[PDB]
Amino acid sequence: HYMRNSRAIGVLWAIFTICFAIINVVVFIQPYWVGDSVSTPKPGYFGLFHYCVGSGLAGRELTCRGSFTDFSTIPSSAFKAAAFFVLLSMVLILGCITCFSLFFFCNTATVYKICAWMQLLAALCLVLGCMIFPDGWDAETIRDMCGAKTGKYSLGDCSVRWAYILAIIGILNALILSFLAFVLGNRQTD
Amino acid sequence: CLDGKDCASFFCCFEDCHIRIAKMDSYARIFFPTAFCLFNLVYWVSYLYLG
Amino acid sequence: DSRDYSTELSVTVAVGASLLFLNILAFAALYYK
Numbered sequence A: 001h002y003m004r005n006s007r008a009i010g011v012l013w014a015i016f017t018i019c020f021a022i023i024n025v026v027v028f029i030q031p032y033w034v035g036d037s038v039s040t041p042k043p044g045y046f047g048l049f050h051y052c053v054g055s056g057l058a059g060r061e062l063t064c065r066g067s068f069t070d071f072s073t074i075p076s077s078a079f080k081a082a083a084f085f086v087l088l089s090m091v092l093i094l095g096c097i098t099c100f101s102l103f104f105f106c107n108t109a110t111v112y113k114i115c116a117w118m119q120l121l122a123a124l125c126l127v128l129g130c131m132i133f134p135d136g137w138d139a140e141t142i143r144d145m146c147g148a149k150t151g152k153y154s155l156g157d158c159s160v161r162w163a164y165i166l167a168i169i170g171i172l173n174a175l176i177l178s179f180l181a182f183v184l185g186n187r188q189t190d
Numbered sequence B: 001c002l003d004g005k006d007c008a009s010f011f012c013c014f015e016d017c018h019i020r021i022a023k024m025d026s027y028a029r030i031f032f033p034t035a036f037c038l039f040n041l042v043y044w045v046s047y048l049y050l051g
Numbered sequence C: 001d002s003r004d005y006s007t008e009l010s011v012t013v014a015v016g017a018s019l020l021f022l023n024i025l026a027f028a029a030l031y032y033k
């Protein structure tokens, strides 16, 4: 029972880590953090680096620009910092999945602790990214798309879309999985 | 640390941490293949499908 | 397009909350001595 239950919850924790890595990848890639609104002058959306803006002629005609491999196209330094921090979180969580292999040779509890620390660090990086990302709304492009009312730390006319709330979900999931990993690593010792 | 262990004993692994260094090759025989096969999957799925 | 985001946000918070409660169920399995 005790060994069986510990093994089962450890495997479930591994599946959770994989799921959170999927969440982190999709939020980093998909540029749907913030979107237009009914009161917005011009339609469009923008993520951490990629942003699409509508020409505004009662049609879609979305012109899309931005890419992490060229920092010049990113609208603002805050966007660059947020993208870098989310990338670092991705590197850490993906690193944790790799460490899983160490279960073959190394002690279980120590590697559980390694991942607990990695996942905590990934959660912190995601927190920093989500904290710094709103700072970039004062850039000229986001102001032009959303309108003049938008400013630093102000949604204004534009509204949040699924990627940002999914990022917050990922923060919570990462932190709670880190706590789970710590407790499991200490529990295996008994 | 609700279990009652010290903060260092609960979180950090400061009990013996290196003594086990000779087993790096045994470690690297999976750590490097796993990372690359894992790196390729995120790289390729990112460009072809998610973007 | 109808520039409203409620159903999308609804399904996102639904799936996120589902994952979170099932994580709390994992703790319910764990802490239950």
Ligand SMILES: CCCCCCCC/C=C\CCCCCCCC(=O)O[C@H](COC(=O)CCCCCCCCCCCCCCC)COP(=O)(O)OC[C@@H](O)CO
Residues within 6 Å of the ligand: A007, A010, A011, A014, A015, A018, A097, A100, A101, A103, A104, A105, A106, A107, A108, B034
């Ligand atoms: C799309 C992304 C896919 C991600 C793919 C991830 C896969 C990454 C590659 C390899 C992982 C290798 C895992 C090897 C685990 C094998 C570990 C094992 O042998 O079992 C024991 C229990 O361990 C444990 O509870 C650890 C349990 C590990 C469970 C996690 C591995 C299974 C992953 C299931 C795949 C789900 C995919 C679904 C995604 C939707 C530990 O040994 P043991 O006491 O005798 O030693 C004592 C010591 O003193 C000397 O060995």
Ligand SMILES: CCCCCCCC/C=C\CCCCCCCC(=O)O[C@H](COC(=O)CCCCCCCCCCCCCCC)COP(=O)(O)OC[C@@H](O)CO
Residues within 6 Å of the ligand: A068, A069, A070, A071, A072, A091
């Ligand atoms: C030859 C091969 C051997 C070398 C390999 C080295 C490996 C290094 C690794 C990481 C550090 C990356 C350093 C890249 C430095 C490359 C140099 C560089 O950044 O170029 C600048 C800007 O480029 C840019 O915006 C791009 C800046 C962002 C660069 C970051 C891309 C991600 C790198 C992925 C790392 C994953 C690590 C994972 C390992 C586990 C030029 O400015 P400039 O005013 O002229 O433009 C004017 C404007 O009009 C056009 O942009």
Ligand SMILES: CCCCCCCCCCCC(=O)OC[C@H](COP(=O)([O-])O)OC(=O)CCCCCCCCCCC
Residues within 6 Å of the ligand: B026, B027, B029, B030, B033
């Ligand atoms: C293409 C591969 C073909 C060969 C198949 C793999 C060889 C498997 C044979 C068993 C090898 C083995 O377990 O012993 C090596 C070490 C333990 O070393 P030792 O001190 O007990 O002698 O234990 C280990 O390190 C476990 C073996 C892990 C090997 C991983 C192979 C990955 C291949 C990557 C392909 C891209």
Ligand SMILES: CC(C)CCC[C@@H](C)[C@H]1CC[C@H]2[C@@H]3CC=C4C[C@@H](O)CC[C@]4(C)[C@H]3CC[C@]12C
Residues within 6 Å of the ligand: A029, A067, A068, A069, A090, A091, A094, A095, A098, B035, B038, B039, B042, B043, B046
């Ligand atoms: C060493 C192991 C554990 C981690 C490897 C991290 C890998 C998966 C990371 C490092 C750099 C990352 C890339 C950095 C920049 C971009 C450009 C973006 O437009 C699409 C995603 C893409 C292409 C990333 C995909 C994932 C990536 C390749």
Ligand SMILES: CCCCCCCCCC
Residues within 6 Å of the ligand: A021, A022, A025, A094, B038, B041, B042, B045, B050
């Ligand atoms: C269904 C889309 C999956 C995108 C790639 C997820 C990678 C997870 C980390 C390896």
Ligand SMILES: [Cl-]
Residues within 6 Å of the ligand: A049, A066, A067, A068, A069, A070
């Ligand atoms: Cl890009």
